[PDB]
């Protein structure tokens, strides 16, 4: 995965739910959707649970990077929980050798 839109969020939810579990190596720094997945895994408690200030900051980044209105941002936060659930398949390529 690099950068991507909300379409790659639904693609990640598809490929995660595929069994055999195709691991989603999400490359960082490219930004936009991979930055929602990246800042999710950067501050991930357990699976799709991330905290309140980071979830409504993510609502701002879905309302700006995706321009999805706040209800649809909570919708892609529900899909954020559903995708981030398999952090063992998410592999953050945070460069910064």
């Amino acid at each position: 995965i690099v950068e991507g839109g909300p379409n790659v969020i639904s693609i990640v939810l598809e490929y995660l739910r595929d069994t055999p579990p195709v691991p989603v190596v999400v490359c960082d720094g490219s930004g936009r959707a991979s930055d929602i997945l990246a800042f999710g895994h950067k501050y991930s408690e357990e699976g799709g649970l991330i905290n309140e200030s980071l979830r409504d900051q993510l609502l701002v980044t879905i309302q700006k990077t995706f321009t999805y209105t706040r209800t649809q941002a909570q919708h892609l936060f529900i899909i954020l929980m559903e995708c981030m659930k398999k952090k063992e398949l998410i592999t953050v390529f945070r460069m910064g050798h």
């Binding site: 200030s53 409504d56 900051q57 701002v60």
Partner: peptide, 26 residues
């Protein structure tokens, strides 16, 4: 310079989220 400028950009990560959160608050 490597550890100190590692500190500056990683701490302005907090400042970049701070201005964006105040934008939601305004």
């Amino acid at each position: 310079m490597s550890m100190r400028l590692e500190e500056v950009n990683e701490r302005e990560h907090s400042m970049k989220a701070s201005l964006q959160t105040v934008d939601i608050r305004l």
